[PDB]
Amino acid sequence: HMEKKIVYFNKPGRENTEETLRLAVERAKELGIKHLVVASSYGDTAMKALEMAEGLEVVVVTYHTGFVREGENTMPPEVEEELRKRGAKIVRQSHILSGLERSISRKLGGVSRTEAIAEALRSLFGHGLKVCVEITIMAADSGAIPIEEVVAVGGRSRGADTAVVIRPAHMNNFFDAEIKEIICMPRNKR
Amino acid sequence: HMEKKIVYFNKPGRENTEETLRLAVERAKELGIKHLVVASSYGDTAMKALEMAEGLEVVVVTYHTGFVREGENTMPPEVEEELRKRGAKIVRQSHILSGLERSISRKLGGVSRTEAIAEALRSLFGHGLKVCVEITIMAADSGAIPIEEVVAVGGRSRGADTAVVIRPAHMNNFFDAEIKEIICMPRNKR
Amino acid sequence: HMEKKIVYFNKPGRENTEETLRLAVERAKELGIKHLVVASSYGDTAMKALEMAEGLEVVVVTYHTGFVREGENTMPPEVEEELRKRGAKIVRQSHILSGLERSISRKLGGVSRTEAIAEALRSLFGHGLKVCVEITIMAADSGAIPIEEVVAVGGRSRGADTAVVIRPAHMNNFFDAEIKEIICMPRNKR
Amino acid sequence: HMEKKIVYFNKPGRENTEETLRLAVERAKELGIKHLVVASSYGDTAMKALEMAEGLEVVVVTYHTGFVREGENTMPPEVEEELRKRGAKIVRQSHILSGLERSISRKLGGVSRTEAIAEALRSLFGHGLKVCVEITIMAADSGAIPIEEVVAVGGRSRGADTAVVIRPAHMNNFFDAEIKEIICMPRNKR
Amino acid sequence: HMEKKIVYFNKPGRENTEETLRLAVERAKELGIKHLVVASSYGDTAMKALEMAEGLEVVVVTYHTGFVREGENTMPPEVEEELRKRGAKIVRQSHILSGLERSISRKLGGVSRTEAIAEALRSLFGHGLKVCVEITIMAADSGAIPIEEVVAVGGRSRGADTAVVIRPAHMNNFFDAEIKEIICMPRNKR
Amino acid sequence: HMEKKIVYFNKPGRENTEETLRLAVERAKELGIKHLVVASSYGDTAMKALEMAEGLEVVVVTYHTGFVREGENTMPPEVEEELRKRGAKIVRQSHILSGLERSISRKLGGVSRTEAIAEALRSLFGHGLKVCVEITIMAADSGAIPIEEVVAVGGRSRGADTAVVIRPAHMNNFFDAEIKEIICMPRNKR
Ligand SMILES: Cc1cc2nc3c(=O)[nH]c(=O)nc-3n(C[C@H](O)[C@H](O)[C@H](O)COP(=O)(O)O)c2cc1C
Numbered sequence A, B, C, D, E, F: 001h002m003e004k005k006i007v008y009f010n011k012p013g014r015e016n017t018e019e020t021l022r023l024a025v026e027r028a029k030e031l032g033i034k035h036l037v038v039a040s041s042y043g044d045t046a047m048k049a050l051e052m053a054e055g056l057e058v059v060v061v062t063y064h065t066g067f068v069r070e071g072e073n074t075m076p077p078e079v080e081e082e083l084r085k086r087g088a089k090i091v092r093q094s095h096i097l098s099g100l101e102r103s104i105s106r107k108l109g110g111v112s113r114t115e116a117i118a119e120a121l122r123s124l125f126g127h128g129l130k131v132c133v134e135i136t137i138m139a140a141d142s143g144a145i146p147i148e149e150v151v152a153v154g155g156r157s158r159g160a161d162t163a164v165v166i167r168p169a170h171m172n173n174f175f176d177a178e179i180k181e182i183i184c185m186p187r188n189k190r
């Protein structure tokens, strides 16, 4: 057995961003992990991650085109260009913990099994954990990370509040993904 | 923020039982928690929990009647009688992270949203975490615990390997349940 | 073939309680049945059942804790204590003809297969029949009745209006449950 | 309240056909019901129903074309012609307690809510009751019966073993259908 | 390979009726097809189809009884009588691209797999194509057409705007149905 | 109304690749369409598309990483590099007409609404049409195409056999996608 630190935040959400990234990088370095997978909708957390990465490869997972308005991206080109210049990979694809079922539930009614899994992760462990899982599958399916332990970072709405060590998998073998360690999360999710 | 210990086990399953209970009791006492909710199919973990509880109220959650063979219980009367003599509460009811949908998926085919949630908890966090959640809802619905933070304990197949601090909820408000802290779990679930 | 009496009530609901119990007990005694399984939310029907049981074992199935408000019971302690003094068993657990799917349908939308079965029983045969089935599975899963024919009693909202002879089963073998006889029910369910 | 006869058969299935029809006609006449809705796959029960109808209008509900082999009917033309000559209506359409979902569950896997309702009716009340319900909705949707109480007759595999008094409804208002009385059914469904 | 004409209409709906029928009949005759399957709710398109059929057998598929109001038909008797006099077959049965699931989604919430298929056909190819498919399965299940290529015609709300050459199938082998050719459809569905 | 050519192939599959691309490019140029979205698993169809594009922008949609083996890509780096050199965009992301539901149906059983839509497209219109739709949503979600009419190309297993003019949409507004024209498809899908 391994006794490790876990950090619990008093509140969820964006105030926790810098500490989450610090702890994420700290654990990655202890484990010899190479990839830091970070959710960033508009680019703030991505930029902070690059500043703090200390040599880790940063894989930024952003919103699918059309998440807010069809055909539009939340992260603007000038931000994306700077992230790429600083060596980030950018993953932009469908959100795999809802998928096409979101169109059906929104327009016609009734949620799917996938959406139920998403909501149980949100409720039990917080939105940031749900996102950690979701972005890891997306990064894997998009070919941005290998099937090796990575550190994933997500949050509630904006910024970051949760970091995990996770073994990735794909949309066709989701039950092979595994949370190895929880580095930090809000004690209070809501 | 709160920096706490989390213990990761190298293997899942029954070898971790005594350490899981020790750590569960340790955290409950730090937090002023009164109830220890423990999964025990045949009674072994329940008996160990009572020995180690140091004044906590132990709520034992066992298998539903008929889990293996219709009309039969896995925990035998002599064990149940001893647990009750030592002050345990016993919860015996339907397993709420499958429910009647298990009859449908087994006989007719296709899993439900509830069963999908269960499997995602098993795969991401291990069977013991899934059980921690499940038994907490069952204990709440059966009227054995209040809606206050409790420590829940479960494992892979037999014994215990996972302990959490959890805010309970019921079958009709499941998304109000929340994992506040993870005390210990297997690093490797399988 | 066996020609038997069935009693059809003109209206559903609580006005039928005493006659339903009378007919339930009458049929149980004809068949040599030992257990009378009765739904009672607040305790009225349970108390009447005990008065009328004539030596049958009464198994009272009540609401899950949290059915109305989280952490609260509809049947109050003083009633529960009196029922136990008079020899009733009390079953309090999750309602198995909805289960965790009720949280999903209420919060996120869309009903499950289990909830669809429940509604078809309510519509075709009345709420009291649906309850008869539901409480029999619950009583079985909670270990309160054997897998032998029992008489079950339920109603529309309050009291009783339907009684059946039923072969129990569990949440994992629901399709083995069987209605052997319908003793009484409302001709008009609504 | 109304005290009536119900007849319970010792075995399910085809041996009960003549008695089921006799009892069905008897009850229809007591109630002033005009329509007798009868399941007949190959025509035997339909022919017997016409012989025994004593002035009731017989609505025969048969298998959908393709139930056994695509493009083929189980009831042959010579039988259909004789039934029509004797004044029967013939309903031949999709089986509405499975519908298109049967193609999905058979080819791709997983049963629907509709198929789950069907199976619960089969298990709790027997196949003949399930059929009584199903054929009443089909007869209504096909325009063969009005929305008035009718007597419906069905069975296990062949012949008849169950008769009910039922208020019809359609595929779009199924929960308005109601079983008013159960005239006869097998005590033992299987 | 076969180079053929397809006609795209600028608008969906009833304005396209006469041209759709003309093109449908034209293609049927080129292929030696015998049956023209036409959706007609109130009878207008059916009557026009008979006028234009030039010796094809017209199979009219109308609304299920109760589509608007329980127990009522949209096509009135005087129209049905005239269609039959002119040699049409009339199919009136449950709408198989929703079925009983429509009662569940309307009353209780959440759409089925069948309803999701229907909506995807409506959105991708227009309501008229969805109807072409639906009425072909209905006509097959009702025994009105053989399992041979037919031309099917449907539209948006009223009239016709889409015609296809289709290989029929039944509710239990839906995935054997196949669109061989699209004769005409709206370029703009909405 | 617009009378246009549609080409029907006698057989599905890879033999149709060059003609499908020729017809796709022909129609795009007639309409002033700028983007040709092409499915290519291993790269063959992509390379042919670039050769034949005549100035259109080619958006290649390939398999998700892990489609065959976790962590592996079907299109090898040397092919991807050449496609990029020749000006193709490459979309690699989760397959949105199955998504995470594929893990659930494969491991646990039962298909989703999304998978049912996919299968209905495959059966009615052929695998190549299904792919045309799927890759258009993926290309949109990945930010590779605007919400303007595009020509999409897909096939049965390998190569191409179907081309459409399609208005894209995203995973959250799928029912806004629309097939404007079918350029070519197999008359016989299987
Ligand atoms: C693919 C994706 C899915 C997300 N899902 C959720 C969600 O379910 N709940 C939530 O609160 N935030 C969600 N987020 C937000 C992230 O957790 C994170 O707070 C955000 O991307 C950071 O953006 P910023 O760097 O611009 O602040 C999601 C983000 C992404 C990229």
Ligand SMILES: Cc1cc2nc3c(=O)[nH]c(=O)nc-3n(C[C@H](O)[C@H](O)[C@H](O)COP(=O)(O)O)c2cc1C
Pocket: B039, B040, B041, B042, B043, B044, B045, B046, B061, B062, B063, B064, B095, B127, B128, B130, B131, B134, B135, B154, B155, B156, B157, B158, B159, B160
């Ligand atoms: C309600 C209930 C559900 C359970 N579900 C699972 C499960 O999903 N997977 C698993 O490996 N063990 C499961 N278990 C087993 C428990 O996690 C634990 O290992 C067991 O109850 C301990 O029994 P013992 O004390 O007799 O060893 C379940 C136990 C209970 C009581």
Ligand SMILES: Cc1cc2nc3c(=O)[nH]c(=O)nc-3n(C[C@H](O)[C@H](O)[C@H](O)COP(=O)(O)O)c2cc1C
Pocket: C039, C040, C041, C042, C043, C044, C045, C046, C061, C062, C063, C064, C095, C127, C128, C130, C131, C134, C135, C154, C155, C156, C157, C158, C159, C160
């Ligand atoms: C587990 C459970 C489920 C019930 N479900 C329903 C229901 O679906 N519809 C309904 O009208 N009543 C339902 N009831 C109410 C019972 O049928 C019965 O009328 C009630 O429990 C009697 O309570 P009383 O004795 O306090 O009057 C349910 C009761 C229980 C205990």
Ligand SMILES: Cc1cc2nc3c(=O)[nH]c(=O)nc-3n(C[C@H](O)[C@H](O)[C@H](O)COP(=O)(O)O)c2cc1C
Pocket: D039, D040, D041, D042, D043, D044, D045, D046, D061, D062, D063, D064, D095, D127, D128, D130, D131, D134, D135, D154, D155, D156, D157, D158, D159, D160
């Ligand atoms: C629409 C339809 C559905 C049926 N479904 C079932 C069924 O679920 N189970 C069963 O045992 N028989 C089923 N049957 C059979 C009937 O209950 C009845 O036994 C049969 O139609 C009588 O045919 P016969 O007169 O040729 O003997 C069905 C029949 C029809 C027409």
Ligand SMILES: Cc1cc2nc3c(=O)[nH]c(=O)nc-3n(C[C@H](O)[C@H](O)[C@H](O)COP(=O)(O)O)c2cc1C
Pocket: E039, E040, E041, E042, E043, E044, E045, E046, E061, E062, E063, E064, E095, E127, E128, E130, E131, E134, E135, E154, E155, E156, E157, E158, E159, E160
């Ligand atoms: C079984 C059936 C299902 C139909 N479903 C739809 C539908 O989904 N959307 C729609 O716009 N029209 C639908 N229609 C309407 C038809 O496509 C067609 O426009 C109509 O039946 C023509 O009726 P009329 O001849 O009285 O104008 C449906 C019609 C039938 C008979």
Ligand SMILES: Cc1cc2nc3c(=O)[nH]c(=O)nc-3n(C[C@H](O)[C@H](O)[C@H](O)COP(=O)(O)O)c2cc1C
Pocket: F039, F040, F041, F042, F043, F044, F045, F046, F061, F062, F063, F064, F095, F127, F128, F130, F131, F134, F135, F154, F155, F156, F157, F158, F159, F160
């Ligand atoms: C995202 C994606 C999904 C696909 N789904 C299917 C499918 O459902 N059925 C099928 O026969 N082919 C499917 N294909 C194969 C394509 O239609 C096409 O034949 C193939 O990608 C061409 O690869 P090649 O250029 O290496 O021959 C799919 C391809 C992709 C990229």
